[PDB]
Design a protein around this ligand. Sequence first.
Ligand SMILES: [Mg+2]
Ligand SMILES: [Mg+2]
Ligand SMILES: [Zn+2]
Lengths: 81, 246, 49
Amino acid sequence: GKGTPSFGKRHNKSHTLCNRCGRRSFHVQKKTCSSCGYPAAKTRSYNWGAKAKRRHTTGTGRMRYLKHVSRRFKNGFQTGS
Amino acid sequence: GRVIRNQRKGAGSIFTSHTRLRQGAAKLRTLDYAERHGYIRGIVKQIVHDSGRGAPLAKVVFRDPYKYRLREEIFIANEGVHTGQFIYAGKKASLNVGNVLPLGSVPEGTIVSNVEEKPGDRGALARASGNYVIIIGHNPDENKTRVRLPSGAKKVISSDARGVIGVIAGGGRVDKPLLKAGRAFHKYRLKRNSWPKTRGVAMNPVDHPHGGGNHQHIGKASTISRGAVSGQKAGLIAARRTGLLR
Amino acid sequence: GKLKKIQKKYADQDETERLLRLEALGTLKGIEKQQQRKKEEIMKREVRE
RNA sequence: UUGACCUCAAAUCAGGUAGGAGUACCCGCUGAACUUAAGCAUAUCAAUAAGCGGAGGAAAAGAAACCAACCGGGAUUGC
RNA sequence: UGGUGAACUAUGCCUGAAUAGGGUGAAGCCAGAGGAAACUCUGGUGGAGGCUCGUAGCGGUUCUGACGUGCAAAUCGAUCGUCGAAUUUGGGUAUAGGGGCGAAAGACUAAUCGAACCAUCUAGUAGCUGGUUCCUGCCGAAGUUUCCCUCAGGAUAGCAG
RNA sequence: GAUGGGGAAGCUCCGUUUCAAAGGCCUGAUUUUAUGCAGGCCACCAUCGAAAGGGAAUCCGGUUAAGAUUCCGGAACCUGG
RNA sequence: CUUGUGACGGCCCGUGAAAAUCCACAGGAAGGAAUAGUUUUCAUGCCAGGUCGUACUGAUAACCGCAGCAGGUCUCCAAGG
RNA sequence: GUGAUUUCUGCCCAGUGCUCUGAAUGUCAAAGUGAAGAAAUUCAACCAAGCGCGGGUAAACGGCGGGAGUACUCUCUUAAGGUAGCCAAAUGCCUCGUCAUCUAAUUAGUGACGCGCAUGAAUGGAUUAACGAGAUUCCCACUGUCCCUAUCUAC
RNA sequence: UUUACUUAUUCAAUGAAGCGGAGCUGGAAUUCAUUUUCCACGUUCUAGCAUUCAAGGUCCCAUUCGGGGCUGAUCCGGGUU
RNA sequence: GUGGCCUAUCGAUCCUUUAGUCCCUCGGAAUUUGAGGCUAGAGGUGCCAGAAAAGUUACCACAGGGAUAACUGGCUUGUGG
Ligand SMILES: [Mg+2]
Ligand SMILES: [Mg+2]
Ligand SMILES: [Zn+2]
């Protein structure tokens, strides 16, 4: 009974939500996220996972400060009014 | 081939010793000043059972000579020690059972136990139940003592090493048959995960050197060289002789 | 090379144990048979004469 | 006793700086096998892919412990 | 090559929990009797055992029953093994892929195991199988020679344009 | 599972009291006063880990379409000050 | 009958957690009364008790098995013959 | 490794392993030493462990033969020649072995026999109470398994 | 090949507490002139107790509430053993 | 008369080595060792136009094959009847 009766015993999560990415990939016993690598300082990325890099790279979010850097450069980082 | 069972034992994943119900390391009192210039008197408060150990332990209380407090040491109980007995530890201690005299100050034929190898490691030799060390001879110049060990070997150790006079309590245990796989289960359940033992000749050849074949047989000789490597040392390692002698 | 090993592992030993261990290891029979082979080496010359 | 020197510390001491992201191109380390040899082990793939460390608008290299053998040339880079 | 899994399951640890009613009647003890003494006998008491019949529970022997495009990628029915322990089990925790764990079947490691899964190298290689897209006109074969780890393949000569 | 350390080219690995100068505790004293200087005491030595282990203390009656040992009425208890 | 508990008895080469936390004792540091104090482990009296969860199912239809699947999934209460 | 108890575990160290505190130039690396050379280099001596020589070891892996005479003896060969036990056994080709028993009839069962293709002693041998969803034979009871089929209910 | 030496290196313990040398004070000791040495150098019927820079002695201070130094508890070398 | 009366009686590249020329080269210039070349032999591939090479799989896998076995059918009928 490795199929249907064994699927009834599944009610204990191995992963919960992660703090940096909100992914539900944070392993409870390992205390590590399997997608972004929290709590390591570097973010988990691999050159074989180029599509995953495309999924989580810069520009897939809000860019709350980086949207204005090109415009401030074009104006020359001016000050005043 | 796979990694065999005795090869897997050294990682210590499930092969660590079960130490939940143990009462502390049974060591001798440290050799500070009193034990090497005079003696010191302590008291046996209780004799208790140690989990996974065949011998009982003794809880001996001394006074700290430098601070107002009490020290509690765990000795291995000698056969004949009772609760409320005064235990004397030191160079000038009188020769009675339970006392912790150094080996330079006991005569020929003395039976001691919990013997230090070097002076100060707080007990190494003859600690299992019913075992003892006999003093075979002295050597004052180049101050050493010869001792007979429980294995029958004769060691030559320092005369400043200490030992508890008498034999370890709880002797004669292995004379009783266990009679039951349940009894062996409860015996090893508090020691470590090394039981039950599957024979390697009953395995598959991926799992052991002895495994495989259309009959259960070893194949090559079971005596293994000392220069063999891990994964090969399964059998009788470096056997000088085999068989039942008559 | 042999003398290093005796200093390494047989320094603390007495002659009763030494005789027991060489009798249990069977080298004493080899020494006996080597001296015996010397004895028939002399003895065959004596029988020839 | 007092005052130096040397060395080593402590401060939510005064002021600073490093980490992470990106990584097409750049500077290094580490490092395969599929494949080809009509098999295969040196070889090849390849001083490559994957892995790790570190920069900039370029980086690196760069003003000879050079090339030459000629009636000698003259930093580096690229075609 | 680099990562992800012990939510199933294997094993150890830590902390909890669960297990009707019967049968047999072990030590210890009490009374009576006998004996010269050792000690024996009889009647009770007591309630031992990896004992036994048998529920809940755990498992899965047979019908090679049902079903077999099923209720179900392993179930249903009857018959069964076991049922106070080497028992069953929750949660926490540890062991990760030539590695783990195994009362040992090459078993189990998320329906995947005589080496898991994911992505990349990778459009891996194939003397082997299958396919290969409009018309008309003209010419029109070979299965033979020699060499090859050659015998389902090539080179070379021949035949053809 | 950090730190002190020690490996590792490195991502990181070991170790958890270790070859560390590892800290805070009460009385107060002073009443330019702030909290130093009077003192004296103590050496564990991060932290995480149980909604079934340990653990301060609440019960009854009534009430809603849907909440209650939590609201209402009454009657208690514990902790800190 | 279910359950709680007490005093016992049997078993073991099995003798069947730890820490936070609270109390007591030994000790005698120090502070202390006579026109006055000393005591808040006695009684009464005063104030405050933050944050998050709290509905419902828990299974032949609320979970997992592609589903409103005869499967699987821990536990408490338990009337009469 | 073997697998409760009882009773035993015979012979063989030649081979393959394992192991010696033996004896010591046979094999004999790098470094080092010596000679020749102008030097690169060449040639020798010396030379650690391990091999090689000498022992031990079978509850280590394993093994346990032929020819004559009359079970026994002699001889050859070998390391030693299957000991105690057991058997057409789950191990026997021939084989449906031979004898007895069981039946009307038995390639099945059981008890014996043993030149046993190719049984055999911790590769464990023989025996064995109790136990077994283990394999096999016979007997009593019992029955639609069958002679030989018929009928009824629910879906 | 044997054999010193310790500071490199290595192992172990401790909250780095009693190391080494010399000296007292006793005992043995035979001294052949005066001491050569060697052992000691506060604890053993009893499941109590042992802590407040220590009492005492002594010397200062400015007496008072007390405070400090030496000794009690032998010197010397800072090599934790 | 350019081996055996005739028809069989044998071997590439790379590497090593020998003989000859004592000839050519070691590329800044020479001498001498050393090395590399040219011409002709030898050391050998017997699977003989010339890979350096043990098994097992009843746990097995892939690409194919009726070019190829284990059934029936078909031809034949030795053998059988
Ligand atoms: Mg186990
Ligand atoms: Mg085998
Ligand atoms: Zn994350």
